Short mmCIF file of C-alpha atoms in Angstrom, two decimals:
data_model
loop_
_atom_site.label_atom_id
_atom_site.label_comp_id
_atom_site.label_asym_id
_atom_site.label_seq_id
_atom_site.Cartn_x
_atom_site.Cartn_y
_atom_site.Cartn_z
CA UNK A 1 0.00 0.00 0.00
CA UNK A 2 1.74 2.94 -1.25
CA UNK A 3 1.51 6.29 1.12
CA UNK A 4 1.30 10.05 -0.61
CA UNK A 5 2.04 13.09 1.07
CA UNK A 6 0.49 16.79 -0.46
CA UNK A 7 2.37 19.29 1.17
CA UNK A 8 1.58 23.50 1.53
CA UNK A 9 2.63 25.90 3.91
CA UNK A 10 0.01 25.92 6.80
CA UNK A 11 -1.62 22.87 5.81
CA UNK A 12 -5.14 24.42 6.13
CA UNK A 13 -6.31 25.15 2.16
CA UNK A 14 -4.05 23.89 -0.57
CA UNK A 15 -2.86 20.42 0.61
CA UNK A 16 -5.99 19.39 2.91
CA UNK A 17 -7.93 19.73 -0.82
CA UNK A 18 -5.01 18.16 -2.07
CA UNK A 19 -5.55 15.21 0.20
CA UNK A 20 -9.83 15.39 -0.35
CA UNK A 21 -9.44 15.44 -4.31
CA UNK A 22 -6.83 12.79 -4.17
CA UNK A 23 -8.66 10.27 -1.51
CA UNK A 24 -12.05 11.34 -4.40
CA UNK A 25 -9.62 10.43 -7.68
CA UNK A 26 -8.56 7.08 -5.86
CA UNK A 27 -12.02 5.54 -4.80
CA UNK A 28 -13.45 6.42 -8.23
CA UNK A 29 -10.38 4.12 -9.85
CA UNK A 30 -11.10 1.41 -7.41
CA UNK A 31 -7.62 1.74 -5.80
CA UNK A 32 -8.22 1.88 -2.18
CA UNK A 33 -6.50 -0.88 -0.84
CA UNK A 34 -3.19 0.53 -3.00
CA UNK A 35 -2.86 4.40 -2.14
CA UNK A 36 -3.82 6.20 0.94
CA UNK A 37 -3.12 10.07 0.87
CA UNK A 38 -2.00 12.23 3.65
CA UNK A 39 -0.97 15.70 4.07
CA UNK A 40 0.98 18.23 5.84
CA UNK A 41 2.43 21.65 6.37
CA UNK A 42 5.79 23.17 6.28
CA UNK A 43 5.19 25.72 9.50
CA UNK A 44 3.16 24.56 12.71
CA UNK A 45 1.83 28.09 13.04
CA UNK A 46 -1.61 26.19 12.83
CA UNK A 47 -0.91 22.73 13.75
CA UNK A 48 -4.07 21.53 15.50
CA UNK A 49 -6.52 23.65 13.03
CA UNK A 50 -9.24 22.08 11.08
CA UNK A 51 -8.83 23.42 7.52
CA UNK A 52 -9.88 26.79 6.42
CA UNK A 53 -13.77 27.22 6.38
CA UNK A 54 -13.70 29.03 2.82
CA UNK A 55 -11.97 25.87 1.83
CA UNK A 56 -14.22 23.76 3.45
CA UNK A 57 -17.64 25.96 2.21
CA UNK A 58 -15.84 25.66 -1.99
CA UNK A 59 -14.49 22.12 -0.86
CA UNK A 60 -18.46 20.62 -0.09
CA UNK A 61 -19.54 22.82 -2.70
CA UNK A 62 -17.02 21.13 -5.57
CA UNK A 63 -17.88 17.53 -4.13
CA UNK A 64 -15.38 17.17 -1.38
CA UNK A 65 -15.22 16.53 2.63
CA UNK A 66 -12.13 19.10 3.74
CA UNK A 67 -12.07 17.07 6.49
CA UNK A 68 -8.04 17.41 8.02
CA UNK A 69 -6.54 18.81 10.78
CA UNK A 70 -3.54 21.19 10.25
CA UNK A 71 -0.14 19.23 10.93
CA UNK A 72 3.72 20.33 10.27
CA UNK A 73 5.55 18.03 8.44
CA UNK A 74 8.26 15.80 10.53
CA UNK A 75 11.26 14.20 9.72
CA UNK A 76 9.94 10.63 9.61
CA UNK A 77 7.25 12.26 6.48
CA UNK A 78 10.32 11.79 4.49
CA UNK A 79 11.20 8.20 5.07
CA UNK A 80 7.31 6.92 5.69
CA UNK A 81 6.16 8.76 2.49
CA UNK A 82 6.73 6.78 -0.88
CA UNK A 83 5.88 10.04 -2.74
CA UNK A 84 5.40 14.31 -1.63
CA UNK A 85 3.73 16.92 -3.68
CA UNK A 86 4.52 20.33 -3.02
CA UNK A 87 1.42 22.69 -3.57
CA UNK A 88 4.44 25.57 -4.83
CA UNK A 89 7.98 26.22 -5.63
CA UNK A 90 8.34 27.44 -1.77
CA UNK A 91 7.01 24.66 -0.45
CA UNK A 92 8.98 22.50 -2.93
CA UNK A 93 12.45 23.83 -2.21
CA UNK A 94 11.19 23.80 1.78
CA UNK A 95 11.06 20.20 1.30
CA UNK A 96 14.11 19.78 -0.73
CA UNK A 97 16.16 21.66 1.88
CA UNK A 98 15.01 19.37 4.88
CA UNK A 99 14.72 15.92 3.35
CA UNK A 100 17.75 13.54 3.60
CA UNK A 101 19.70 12.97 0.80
CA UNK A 102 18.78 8.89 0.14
CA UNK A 103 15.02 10.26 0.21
CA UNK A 104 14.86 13.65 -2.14
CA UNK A 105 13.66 11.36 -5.21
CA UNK A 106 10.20 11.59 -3.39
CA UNK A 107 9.48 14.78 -3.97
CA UNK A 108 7.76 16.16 -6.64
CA UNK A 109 5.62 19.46 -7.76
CA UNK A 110 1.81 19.05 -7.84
CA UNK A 111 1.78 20.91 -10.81
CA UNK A 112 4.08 18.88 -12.92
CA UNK A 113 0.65 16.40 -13.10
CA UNK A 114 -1.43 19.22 -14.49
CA UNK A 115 -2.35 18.42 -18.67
CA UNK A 116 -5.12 20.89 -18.85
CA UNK A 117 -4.63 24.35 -16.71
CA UNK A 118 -1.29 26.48 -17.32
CA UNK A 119 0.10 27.19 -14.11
CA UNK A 120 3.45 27.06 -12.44
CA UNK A 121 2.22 26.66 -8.89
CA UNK A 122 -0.94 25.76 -6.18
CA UNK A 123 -1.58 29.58 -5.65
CA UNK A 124 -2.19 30.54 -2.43
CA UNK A 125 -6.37 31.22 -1.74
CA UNK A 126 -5.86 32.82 2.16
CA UNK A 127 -5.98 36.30 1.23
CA UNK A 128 -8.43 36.35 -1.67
CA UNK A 129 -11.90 35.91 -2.54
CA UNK A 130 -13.61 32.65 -3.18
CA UNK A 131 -13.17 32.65 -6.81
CA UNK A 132 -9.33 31.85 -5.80
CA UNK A 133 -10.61 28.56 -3.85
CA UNK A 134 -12.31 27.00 -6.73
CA UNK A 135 -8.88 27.89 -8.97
CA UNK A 136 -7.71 25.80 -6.23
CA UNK A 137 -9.46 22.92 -6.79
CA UNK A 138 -9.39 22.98 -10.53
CA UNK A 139 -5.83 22.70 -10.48
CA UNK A 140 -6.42 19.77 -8.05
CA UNK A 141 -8.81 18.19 -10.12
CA UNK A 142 -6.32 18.18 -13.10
CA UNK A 143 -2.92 17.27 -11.60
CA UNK A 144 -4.80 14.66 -9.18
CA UNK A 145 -6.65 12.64 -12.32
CA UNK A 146 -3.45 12.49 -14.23
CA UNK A 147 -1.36 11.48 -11.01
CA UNK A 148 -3.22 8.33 -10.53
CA UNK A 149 -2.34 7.35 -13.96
CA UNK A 150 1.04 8.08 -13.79
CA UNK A 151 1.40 6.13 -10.53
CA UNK A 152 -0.27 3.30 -12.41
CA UNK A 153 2.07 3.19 -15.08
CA UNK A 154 5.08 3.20 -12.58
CA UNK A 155 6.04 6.78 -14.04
CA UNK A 156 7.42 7.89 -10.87
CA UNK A 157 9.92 5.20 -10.20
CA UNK A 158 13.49 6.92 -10.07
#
């Protein structure tokens, strides 16, 4: 059973929908008992937080239960983790600068799975509108449906 980790920086909006959309993608392909999906934050400002309630509000909205609590990402992510997606470059080279060296293969950019929207990141939604959460989860929707395949094929095998 292979573990995946979606990683932002408070772990409140971009990687708990991450984690929703992912969880979604994998019980529609009947892969259940193969992939379970997890996710995390690079700062613990607001570890113990359930996820943002705009996110949650677009989340149910879009067809998703935003259902995590916020967590920081810990050393033993890196080596319990088959595979991390960083929502953005920050949180990418974040990653990069913490994980040990037998273990950086693992991580990867959530956008680098997108075939369909043109974007180089996971933008932020905090400080904007709603229209910005739904972005969100478009982007998720894309990156997450190709993901699965790509796992399938064996794609990600370094």
């Amino acid at each position: 059973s292979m573990k995946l980790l979606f990683v932002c920086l408070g772990n409140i909006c971009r990687s708990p929908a991450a984690e929703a959309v992912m969880k979604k993608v994998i019980q529609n392909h009947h892969l259940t008992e193969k992939y379970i999906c997890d996710s995390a934050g690079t700062c613990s400002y607001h570890e113990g937080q359930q996820a943002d309630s705009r996110m949650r509000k677009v989340g149910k909205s879009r067809g998703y239960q935003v259902d995590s609590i916020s967590r920081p990402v810990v050393s033993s992510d890196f080596k319990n983790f088959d595979y991390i997606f960083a929502m953005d470059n920050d949180n990418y080279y974040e990653l990069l600068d913490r994980c040990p060296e037998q273990y950086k293969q693992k991580i990867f950019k959530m956008v680098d799975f997108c075939t369909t929207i043109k974007t180089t990141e996971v933008p932020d939604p905090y400080y904007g509108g709603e229209k910005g959460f739904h972005r969100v989860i478009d982007i998720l929707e894309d990156a997450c449906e190709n993901l699965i395949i790509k796992l399938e094929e064996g794609k990600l095998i370094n």
